[PDB]
Every structure is written in structure tokens, then in C-alpha cells.
Design a protein around this ligand. Structure first.
Ligand code: VO4
Ligand code: VO4
Ligand SMILES: [Mn+2]
Ligand SMILES: [Mn+2]
Ligand SMILES: [Mn+2]
Ligand SMILES: [Mn+2]
Ligand SMILES: [Zn+2]
Ligand SMILES: [Zn+2]
Lengths: 249, 250
């Protein structure tokens, strides 16, 4: 069995953005269901649990040491690893952290890892196994060394693709060739005429799925500007917006 | 009116420590008043508000841009600045951040400060004014460039001294000569046979105050091991343990 929960669907700024009173941020202050925490997920394959990224600040309250099997990191920007900082001082057995071979990490995680074991680095396009789940690292287009991941079982294929601006050629072809049934994709911005540089806008996501043809694209890493746009514009069939806590089967 | 609220009184590990079943951690789970969030304070002087350190993760819920006057930072360890990372992307006027002239900061705060203005670096023993509050930076003994602060108004004096081990000579002498009525001091550790390197134990605090002679020392940055010790052992007169939400007046 393969399930995926989106625990956070925002970017670093979040929704509401601090001090902002735009339509999306004001709504999220009034109704918590519309809040967006840092982009992160939970994957459950049978009994085995993987935490994708660690930008949430309350992991120590959601989980106890030993209650999940590993972290899987996309990259070392603060909004994807800030939740590791207090966890590392816990009491328990070592916790494997799988991720890209970023040689610097973030602040002093690598020098003072506590119970976190960052030795589990992975390689582009080289499949590795997490309790039987087949995971393929996919290089993304981002200011840090950043991997997305294909998650595969006998019957299911899900892609986790944040943070990215467009996709590198080989990654794009890989996804077209290994069509995911579900793609969770960075779409920080509303439709733009050009670019952007570090994250996709909606036009870029539409262009990418013209190639990949995933039947279910779930947008994440949503900025408050995109949320405001979504309050007044519909998405095309086959696209939906993620929300914090969304469960995917 | 000068008042100080301790919004967090723990170290990086916190109380409860993640996964720990010791008596102090179990107590904090059962009785949340005993939880200890990252070492931080809120100073209110007349109308003005200063946030001392920024390790709390819920600042955006507690405050809005412009609802306080400035941040005052002791140092750039994560447990003292992690709360700044989401806030910087906010909407509003620039927010002054006063602190030591650490050339690196933490991660990409300096490169991408957003609405935070880190240009307000301060100097050892050089007084600066925060809406009438007289503040003196005091070098501490710690693995990062770290300042504590004397806060003074109308001959009322409060020292904020975390994180530190034994105090540098000049700082110790300055405090003896400017005896604070209240000192909030790093005491991460229960009493030890040897002074620890980056944070005081109780014996070091006792030794320091035998020189400074402040009549009221409030211990903070408290580890779960020290809480466990405090559950079975009393502090000497003139020393008390801080707690999250503690209110201090002068
Ligand atoms: O810090 V980012 O979520 O714009 O790569
Ligand atoms: O991260 V510390 O509170 O031991 O300086
Ligand atoms: Mn991000
Ligand atoms: Mn990023
Ligand atoms: Mn500290
Ligand atoms: Mn420190
Ligand atoms: Zn907004
Ligand atoms: Zn404990």
C-alpha cells in the first residue's frame, strides 16, 4: 500500500505571509484550513514511514524517535530543513537522512548532527530501496543542489518535484518515459509571461505536463499571490491544488 | 515601567527533550507550564517593545509587523534566530535588528534579509538608546560572537546574560561596578565539578555572583538534566529558576 500526505503546501513565506492582508492571507488568518506550512510530505509504504523534507516546526510533537523510518530531503534550503534543528538533540537511535550529496548542508547540521545520520546520500537516476519502495532521485532546476523523487511500487508511480523551475532535459525525459500517475509539483507563481528562475509558474507547469502527460498533477509550494489568483481562476482538468493535510492514495 | 517577560527559558534541545522519559521531561509533557521553549525575552519600556532573541517558532502569531519596535539579538546560533527565517518574507516597514557584528550571520539571513535590517550592529560597552531605554552590549564567553545586555532606566538595572560560560574579565568587572538589581543568566547545567565550556553550570553562576553581588539572579537556558536536579535540590537564597512566561519587574 502506498499513501502520501502533504503536510505543508506553502513556500518559505507561507500563507498567510507575515503582515500581508491580501485576499488569500486575510482568508487564511480567518480560517486555518487555508494556511500553508513549508512544503513537506509523509510517505507510507505498508508500515514504513518516510518524512519528505523537514520544514515544519512541530515534528517533535507529531512523531517520537523511532516512529518513522527515515527522512528524505530534497535540498538544504532552510524552509526544508529547519525542523531538524531541535530534533537532532533527542534521545533515541540514529535516524537515517537520505538526500543529495550537498557538501555544506545547512548551518551546523553536518558538524553537530546529534541523532541524525546524513551519510545516506543518493545519486541522480540511481534507484535505492526504502523498505521495498523504489525511489529514484531526479535532478531539479534550483539554486541549491536539489533532487525530486520518483516513488514506485509494483502498481504505483508518484513523483515529488519541489523545488524547481522547469525541469532539466534528462529529468523531463525520464518522467515522460516513466509517466507518474500522480505528480506533486512546485507551482509557486500564477501564470507568468517569462521564466521564473527558482520556481515554476502555472504556465511552466502546464508546459511540462504537455510533455509528461501525468493524469493527476497536484500543485504545491503555493505562494500567496498564486492563492489569490486561484480565488478567481479555475485550473484545467487534471490539475488540482494541494492543501496542508491532504491525503493521496 | 520597565518589565521583562521570559518567553522561552530552555536551550536548543528544550524541555521536554525529544523522546526523553526522564522525570523533568515527563513532567513537562503532563504539565505544560514546565515546557521550555528557546531562550528569549520581551522587554516593555513604557510603550516600546523589544524582542530579545528570536528562537520561538510562533512569532508571526504573537506579533504583527510594527507591533514591536526592534529585535535585539545575543548571537546567531539557530536556537536564537530560527524564528526570523519565515518573518523576513513579510509585508511591512523595515524592522531593526540590533546585535553583534557577526560577519556571517546564520545561513542566508544577511544575503536575503527581507524586511529585517541587520545594519544595526552594536559595540562592546558602547551604550545605545531604545526609546529611552539605555542598553549596553556586554561580551560573553561562547562559541559564537555573543553579547549580553545591560538594560537601564532611572537607576534600575537588569542584565540579560545568555549564552555564556564564565564571563570575560572586562564584562565581569563592568557588572560588579554596575550591579544589576536582577540578572537573567545562562545556567544550562546542574552543578558540576568542572566549569563547562559553552554554558555555565550552577557552580559557575555562584562563583560569578560572588563577584557581581546581584540580589536577584534568575537562571535560564535550562537543560532537562538541570530540571531533573532542581526537582530534588533547592537553589540557594537569591537564585531562582526562570520559567516560560515569567514576568519580571523593577
Ligand atoms: O527558499 V525557496 O522555497 O524560494 O527555494
Ligand atoms: O546551541 V547552544 O544553546 O549549546 O550555544
Ligand atoms: Mn522551498
Ligand atoms: Mn529551495
Ligand atoms: Mn543557546
Ligand atoms: Mn549559543
Ligand atoms: Zn498575502
Ligand atoms: Zn529528559
Amino acid at each position: 500500500s502506498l499513501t502520501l500526505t502533504l503536510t505543508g503546501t506553502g513556500g518559505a513565506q507561507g500563507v498567510p505571509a507575515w503582515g500581508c492582508e491580501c485576499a488569500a492571507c486575510a482568508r487564511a488568518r480567518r480560517s486555518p484550513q487555508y494556511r500553508r506550512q513549508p512544503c513537506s510530505g509523509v510517505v507510507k509504504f505498508n508500515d514504513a514511514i518516510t518524512l519528505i523534507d523537514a520544514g515544519l516546526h512541530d515534528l517533535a510533537d507529531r512523531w517520537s524517535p523511532g516512529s518513522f523510518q527515515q527522512f528524505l530531503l530534497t535540498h538544504y534550503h532552510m524552509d526544508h530543513v529547519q525542523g531538524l534543528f531541535p530534533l537532532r538533540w533527542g534521545v533515541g537511535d540514529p535516524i537515517p537522512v537520505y538526500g543529495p550529496p550537498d557538501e555544506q548542508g545547512c548551518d551546523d547540521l553536518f558538524k553537530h548532527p546529534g541523532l541524525l545520520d546524513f551519510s545516506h546520500t543518493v545519486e541522480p537516476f540511481v534507484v535505492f530501496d526504502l523498505q521495498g519502495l523504489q525511489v529514484t532521485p531526479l535532478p531539479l532546476n534550483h539554486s541549491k543542489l536539489t533532487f525530486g523523487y520518483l516513488l514506485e511500487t509494483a502498481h504505483s508511480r508518484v513523483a515529488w518535484l519541489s523545488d524547481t523551475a522547469g525541469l532539466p532535459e534528462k529529468t523531463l525525459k525520464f518522467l515522460r518515459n516513466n509517466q507518474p500517475q500522480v505528480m506533486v509539483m512546485d507551482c509557486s507563481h500564477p501564470p507568468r509571461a517569462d521564466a521564473p528562475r527558482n520556481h515554476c509558474d502555472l504556465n511552466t507547469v502546464l508546459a511540462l505536463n504537455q510533455v509528461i502527460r501525468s493524469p493527476r498533477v497536484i500543485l504545491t509550494h503555493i505562494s500567496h499571490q498564486f492563492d489569490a489568483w486561484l480565488m478567481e481562476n479555475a485550473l484545467p482538468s487534471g490539475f488540482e491544488v494541494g492543501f496542508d493535510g491532504m491525503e493521496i492514495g
